[PDB]
Design a binder for this molecule. Sequence first.
Ligand SMILES: *[C@@H]1O[C@H](CO)[C@@H](O[C@@H]2O[C@H](CO)[C@@H](O)[C@H](O)[C@H]2NC(C)=O)[C@H](O)[C@H]1NC(C)=O
Ligand SMILES: *[C@@H]1O[C@H](CO)[C@@H](O)[C@H](O)[C@H]1NC(C)=O
Ligand SMILES: *[C@@H]1O[C@H](CO)[C@@H](O)[C@H](O)[C@H]1NC(C)=O
Ligand SMILES: *[C@@H]1O[C@H](CO)[C@@H](O)[C@H](O)[C@H]1NC(C)=O
Ligand SMILES: *[C@@H]1O[C@H](CO)[C@@H](O)[C@H](O)[C@H]1NC(C)=O
Ligand SMILES: *[C@@H]1O[C@H](CO)[C@@H](O)[C@H](O)[C@H]1NC(C)=O
Ligand SMILES: *[C@@H]1O[C@H](CO)[C@@H](O)[C@H](O)[C@H]1NC(C)=O
Ligand SMILES: *[C@@H]1O[C@H](CO)[C@@H](O)[C@H](O)[C@H]1NC(C)=O
Ligand SMILES: *[C@@H]1O[C@H](CO)[C@@H](O)[C@H](O)[C@H]1NC(C)=O
Lengths: 229, 348, 272, 99, 49
Amino acid sequence: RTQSYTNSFTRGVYYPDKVFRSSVLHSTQDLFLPFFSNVTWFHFNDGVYFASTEKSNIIRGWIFGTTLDSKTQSLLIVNNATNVVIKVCEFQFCNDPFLDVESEFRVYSSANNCTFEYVSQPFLMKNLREFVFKNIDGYFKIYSKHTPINLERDLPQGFSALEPLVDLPIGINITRFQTLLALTAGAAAYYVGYLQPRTFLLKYNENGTITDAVDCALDPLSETKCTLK
Amino acid sequence: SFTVEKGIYQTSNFRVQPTESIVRFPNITNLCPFHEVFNATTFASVYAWNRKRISNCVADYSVIYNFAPFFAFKCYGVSPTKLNDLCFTNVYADSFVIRGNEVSQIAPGQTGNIADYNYKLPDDFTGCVIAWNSNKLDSKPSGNYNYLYRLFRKSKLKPFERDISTSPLQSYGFRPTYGVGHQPYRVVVLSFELLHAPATVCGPKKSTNLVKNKCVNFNFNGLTGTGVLTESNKKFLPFQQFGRDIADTTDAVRDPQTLEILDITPCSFGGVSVITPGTNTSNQVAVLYQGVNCTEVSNVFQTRAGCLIGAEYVNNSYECDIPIGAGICASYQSQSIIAYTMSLGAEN
Amino acid sequence: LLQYGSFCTQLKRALTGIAVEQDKNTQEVFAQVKQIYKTPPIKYFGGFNFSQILPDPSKPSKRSPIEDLLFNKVTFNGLTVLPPLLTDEMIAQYTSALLAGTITSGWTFGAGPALQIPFPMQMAYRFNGIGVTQNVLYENQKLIANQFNSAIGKIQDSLSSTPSALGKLQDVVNHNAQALNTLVKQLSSKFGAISSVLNDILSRLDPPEAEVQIDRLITGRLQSLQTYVTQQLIRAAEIRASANLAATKMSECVLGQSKRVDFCGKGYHLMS
Amino acid sequence: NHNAQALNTLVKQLSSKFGAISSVLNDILSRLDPPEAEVQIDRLITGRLQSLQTYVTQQLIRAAEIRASANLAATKMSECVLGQSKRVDFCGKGYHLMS
Amino acid sequence: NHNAQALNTLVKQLSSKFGAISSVLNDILSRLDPPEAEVQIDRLITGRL
Ligand SMILES: *[C@@H]1O[C@H](CO)[C@@H](O[C@@H]2O[C@H](CO)[C@@H](O)[C@H](O)[C@H]2NC(C)=O)[C@H](O)[C@H]1NC(C)=O
Ligand SMILES: *[C@@H]1O[C@H](CO)[C@@H](O)[C@H](O)[C@H]1NC(C)=O
Ligand SMILES: *[C@@H]1O[C@H](CO)[C@@H](O)[C@H](O)[C@H]1NC(C)=O
Ligand SMILES: *[C@@H]1O[C@H](CO)[C@@H](O)[C@H](O)[C@H]1NC(C)=O
Ligand SMILES: *[C@@H]1O[C@H](CO)[C@@H](O)[C@H](O)[C@H]1NC(C)=O
Ligand SMILES: *[C@@H]1O[C@H](CO)[C@@H](O)[C@H](O)[C@H]1NC(C)=O
Ligand SMILES: *[C@@H]1O[C@H](CO)[C@@H](O)[C@H](O)[C@H]1NC(C)=O
Ligand SMILES: *[C@@H]1O[C@H](CO)[C@@H](O)[C@H](O)[C@H]1NC(C)=O
Ligand SMILES: *[C@@H]1O[C@H](CO)[C@@H](O)[C@H](O)[C@H]1NC(C)=O
């Protein structure tokens, strides 16, 4: 776990609602990832932007919890080759839990109690995978995007929307999150950024796909652009 | 006045009435677990209350009417009589038992020990509160002290939260010898979240068939109104349901039962103008429907200003007498009302 | 709403008055002459070349090249737009009549019957009206004709090059668009009510409890309409003043020769 | 005509209710209890104040136009009557002689 | 004189009550509960508009 600092650039734009628009310049106000921010490089707060580019499929699932104890229900997502499972069951996490590859003893002691259960098609599929995780007013939202990329150590420059992927009515306490691995030692890298409230000016095309955005609080020129629409 | 001078006057407007009504709703007929919420014969204490998220089912409330003779039934955001037509985004159920004298303690903009130390509500709350006596069920002859209530706390409770940590807790005394004002009443708080959006728990009513190219009322899972439904061409992505424009108005709908895009257009409307010479001259009139083609209604003549009825078009050109619109004028001439293209002046 | 009074009659009357005034402005500016004069078939006027301002018979709409460039260079819930009474072709015919009358007669057709006069003689008369004798014109005819031709030629390029040369005409359109957009965007406000949709309020509350919510919407919408109407009246006054000035200029700089300074351009006036 | 109709509208605006049980002060004050009658009074107060404001604004807007016309008349008196004017089409159609 | 009179009137209009319990926001907020403070705030807002 070696830290690094890098620049976010123009990444992390998602559709705020489920309404179709075209040939308009709309203005919205929500939690976002500000343009050109110091995102951290690994080898929760309001929300999380996660970015990965590995191919070995060493990464799958996440841990979300407040007390990190089985006494209180803690969100736990597992992702394997054929399905994805979301358990809001009670889990007693180990010191450094991970997938054994295939027992679940090291992931958790046991599930004495459980509330929510979900199973569906796995999220995961040169290529960059981006995910936005955020919970608000007792709801969990996960947005995702897969995009082919060229050879580039840092994040690509451009625009790409984050289509909605899943919504869950979980309604629990989340304060901290940790990364799950399925391991023989090795190395991996991923990018983490944090979201805070912002006002944005989103631009739509004739097909209804977001193509450009403006951060209204970045510099005076952007404020002028926002006030002139 | 009883005499009208020569000219053109605007009298009123016209609109196209709807033909019929179209209702659409999901296939499913799952019944909501409201019965499970009720007649449980065991309800939690006032300070320790359970939640429940009702979803993916049909909500019927007349079963609550046939369930018990409720003592108190208050609603704030909606009207009690027509709960059977709305569709709510989500439902939150709170169930507990409180002393009969404390029924009115819990309410928005209200203060009380139960109000501030057991359960709190927001100022803009939307929902209902139901209550009725259960003395014959939850009152032991020697006293039912299993029900407790909190009385002491450093801080007031926030809206929509549960507290279990724990003498602040005092046990109740319920005996059949007691009268009104002390017997236990069971109470349920129902909370909705109206969002004028597609929702899980709709009403019991049933859909109908779908029509096109006809002015008609519609009700698509709460999207009510009137208009003309036609086939659409917009490229809706799987999560796209509605549609808007620069003016922020609905212009497309996703059909629930058969996933398809439907364009909505407003029905025809406009103004009506009356062309007449003086009453002392003649007694006939002509009518102009502004900005409407003649299909929407000497008999007919289509101009740029709309549809003209009662006037005869002619080749010749004269000086303008009664202005109509884009270069057209009307006049009285064995005798009738004619319309023509005005003349700018004699050639030279 | 019927309990609030008779505001709607006042609104309708004000809007109708504005529209009638709009028609009268154009009528007063352009419909000066009584005859439709026509230019002769042979366009030779002593060396002066008017082809840039006379109507072009090749194109269908019968407009001069400069008029074409000007035409090309300028670009609901109970709200309707009414068409103007005079089409563009009629205005073009008025303009062509004025040009033919001024080319073939001078200032005589504005005071009575039109009387012929050769163009160089008219130009000599106009020189004699600023303190210069006729022999100055008659001995420098070709130089003056060439200078006039070049000056006319430069106008199309001057109009095309400068971007904001026609800002005055664009401002009217922009203000009308902004006012209408604001008026229609005001419909989605709540004004301290449960919702901005009357259908939802009528289908979620008892009849006695709905009036309290409906009154707020009614008051807000009445206030919005009143503000829009007042702004429209104030703008109409300014437009009327502009139209009056334009009519004065048409009568004094086109139908005659003006002695007022800087009224018909910078220099000594000759024609327009 | 306009000066008469404006006054008639202003007078006829008194009998409107503006969202109150009655459109007369004496009856509504005699019957109802003041602690809830003051709001009913306030509604009428605002309703009538708006009518007064509208009337005054319209009168100002008309007065501006009348002043413009009066200035034009003063100029025509100074130029066409006290002298002979060379401006085309300012003192009638033709060559001006007098007025 | 006209400009000065207009500004002075506009400034002095801030101390009117417009049929509310007071003309200071801070006094109303720090005395009444939030569900009733708006009933008095809206009148002040309308008058100032
Ligand atoms: C009047 O001026 C016009 C504009 O320059 C002349 O039309 C040009 O004529 C030349 C030669 O005939 C052409 O090469 C140009 O393309 C023409 N210009 C346009 C815009 O069509 C016209 O010839 C002049 N009239 C006379 C009698 O000389
Ligand atoms: C599981 O739930 C039971 C009650 O159903 C509770 O007594 C027990 O403590 C819970 N287990 C935990 C919190 O680990
Ligand atoms: C993957 O997860 C699903 C979820 O139940 C499980 O059924 C399956 O056995 C797991 N393994 C494979 C190889 O699919
Ligand atoms: C959630 O956990 C945090 C941190 O332990 C705590 O401060 C908070 O009170 C808990 N509950 C909610 C509703 O945030
Ligand atoms: C919009 O969609 C049309 C039809 O699929 C397509 O031809 C056009 O290229 C699209 N516009 C883009 C991709 O900018
Ligand atoms: C609803 O029923 C129709 C007709 O039987 C069918 O075509 C459609 O697929 C059904 N949809 C769902 C979600 O069950
Ligand atoms: C005639 O009415 C139809 C509507 O049915 C409209 O589409 C069409 O444009 C109208 N014709 C003309 C010439 O305006
Ligand atoms: C004049 O009358 C003829 C009759 O054949 C007609 O074809 C033509 O359209 C008329 N001209 C108009 C209506 O302007
Ligand atoms: C101008 O005068 C000449 C004589 O030199 C004549 O041939 C010509 O026709 C005249 N122009 C016109 C338009 O008649």
